[PDB]
C-alpha cells in the first residue's frame, strides 16, 4: 500500500489571485450538475478550467451540500454508485465467459466491499433500509 493522495494547503483563505465571483462558482456547479455530472467531476472541472482550488474554501460549504441545498441531490452516494456499476459490469462480463474464475474472485471482493459502506450508509441512514443490493 502506498501514500498517494492530495495535500490540502495550510490556507483556508481565498487564493488572492482569484478575482472570480463567490456565487458564479455555485451557478457553474449547478450548470454541470444538472447537465448530469458526478460531484468528483464537478470539483475537478471547477479546479481545472474555471480554476478554483476546492469549493469548500471559496464557497460556503462542500459541493454535495451545495447540490442538496440547490435541490440537485443524488439518489445513491457516489462511492456506492460506482461500486454498484463496477459490480454489475463484472457480473455481465462473468455471465459471459463463465471460465474467468479470477473475475469471480474479484466479484467476491467487490461485493464484500459493497456491503461495508452499504451498512455504513444504513447506520447513518443516508439511503434507507429496505435497500438490499438489488
Amino acid at each position: 500500500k502506498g501514500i498517494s493522495s492530495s495535500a490540502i494547503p495550510y490556507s483556508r483563505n481565498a487564493p488572492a489571485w482569484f478575482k472570480l465571483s463567490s456565487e458564479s462558482v455555485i451557478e457553474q456547479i449547478v450548470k454541470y450538475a444538472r447537465k448530469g455530472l458526478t460531484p468528483s467531476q464537478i470539483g475537478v472541472l471547477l479546479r481545472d478550467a474555471h480554476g478554483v482550488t476546492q469549493a469548500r474554501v471559496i464557497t460556503g460549504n462542500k459541493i454535495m451540500r451545495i447540490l442538496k441545498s440547490n435541490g440537485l441531490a443524488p439518489e445513491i452516494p457516489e462511492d456506492l454508485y460506482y461500486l454498484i456499476k463496477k459490480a454489475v459490469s463484472v457480473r455481465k462480463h462473468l455471465e459471459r465467459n463463465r471460465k474467468d474464475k479470477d473475475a469471480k474472485f474479484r466479484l467476491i471482493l467487490i461485493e464484500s466491499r459493497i456491503h461495508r459502506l452499504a451498512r455504513y450508509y444504513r447506520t447513518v441512514a443516508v439511503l434507507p433500509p429496505n435497500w438490499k443490493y438489488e
Partner: protein, 265 residues
C-alpha cells in the same frame, strides 16, 4: 397466453425471468409476423432474467438461435452463439450452434461445426468426438465416424478412449453395423482385459440390439471366466434373463450351472 408486444409486457410483471414463456412469446410474435419485436423479446429475455442464473441466459440464447434458424439468419444465429458465448462457455455455445445447424438441416454447416469442435474440444476432451460421431452417424458413414472418433481420441487423452470405444460400439449396435459393433466390443474388452466393464457393455448392447446368442454366450464366458462369486452370478443372471427373453430355458439353466462352476473353487 402472453403472445404480443403489449399483453406479454403487461402480463410478465409476475415472472420477468420466464425463459420458456418468453421463448413461447417470441415464437408467437414470429408466427404473428413480428420478427423485430420477436427478436427484441428474445434479446431482453436474458436481461429480464437474473444475472447469476446462467442457464436462463443460455435458454434465451437457444430461443433466439432457434428463431434465427427457423425464420431468421445465420448471422443472427452466430450472434446468438456469440450471445450464447456471452451467456455461457464457448464450447457449449458452439455445440448449441451445431445443434441449431442440425435443426436447420445444413449438412456443410454441421460438418464445419463438428470440425471446429473436433479441433479445439477434440483436443480437449471426447465430447467433440461424440459430436463428430453423431454427425457422421446421421450422415450414415460409420467408417468416417469411427475414423473421426479415433482421430479425436488420439488428439485427446486415451484414458477415456475405452469408454469412448464402448460408446461407439453401443451406437453401432443401435443404428450402425452389428459386426462392427461386435468388433469394437472385442477391441474394448481387449483394452480393458482386467475389467469386465466392457464385457457387460457388449452383452447389454447385444441384448438391446437383439443379439441373444451373442450376449448370453459372451456373458456365460465372462461368468465362467476369472471372476468372483458375485461377478459370476451377476453376469450369469443377466445372461439367463436374456436367454429367457429369447426363450432358452436350458441355456438359462446352463448359465447358472457355469456360475456354480466358477463360484466354487
Amino acid at each position: 397466453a402472453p403472445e404480443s408486444v403489449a399483453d406479454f409486457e403487461r402480463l410478465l410483471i409476475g415472472n420477468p425471468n420466464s425463459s420458456v414463456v418468453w421463448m413461447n412469446y417470441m415464437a408467437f410474435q414470429l408466427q404473428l409476423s413480428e420478427i423485430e419485436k420477436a427478436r427484441e423479446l428474445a434479446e431482453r429475455a436474458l436481461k429480464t432474467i437474473n444475472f447469476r442464473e446462467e442457464a436462463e441466459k443460455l435458454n434465451i440464447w437457444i430461443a433466439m438461435l432457434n428463431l434465427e434458424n427457423t425464420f431468421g439468419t445465420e448471422e443472427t444465429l452466430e450472434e446468438v452463439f456469440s450471445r450464447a458465448c456471452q451467456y455461457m462457455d464457448s464450447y457449449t455455445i458452439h455445440t448449441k450452434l451445431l445443434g441449431i445447424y442440425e435443426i436447420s438441416e445444413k449438412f456443410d454447416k454441421a460438418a464445419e461445426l463438428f470440425k471446429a469442435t473436433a479441433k479445439k474440444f477434440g483436443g480437449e476432451k471426447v465430447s467433440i468426438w461424440v459430436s463428430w460421431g453423431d454427425f457422421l452417424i446421421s450422415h450414415n458413414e460409420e467408417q468416417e465416424a469411427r475414423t473421426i472418433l479415433g482421430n479425436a481420441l488420439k488428439a485427446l487423452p486415451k484414458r477415456n478412449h475405452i469408454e469412448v470405444v464402448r460408446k461407439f460400439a453401443q451406437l453401432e449396435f443401435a443404428k450402425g453395423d452389428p459386426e462392427r459393433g461386435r468388433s469394437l466390443f472385442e477391441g474394448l474388452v481387449a483394452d480393458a482385459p482386467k475389467r469386465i466393464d466392457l464385457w457387460n457393455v457388449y452383452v447389454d448392447q447385444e441384448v438391446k440390439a437383439k443379439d441373444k446368442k451373442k450376449v448370453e454366450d459372451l456373458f456365460e464366458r465372462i461368468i465362467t471366466k476369472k471372476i468372483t462369486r458375485k461377478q459370476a452370478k451377476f453376469f450369469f443372471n443377466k445372461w439367463l434373463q436374456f436367454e429367457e427373453s429369447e426363450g432358452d430355458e436350458k441355456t438359462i439353466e446352463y448359465v447358472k450351472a457355469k456360475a456354480t462352476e466358477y463360484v466354487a473353487s
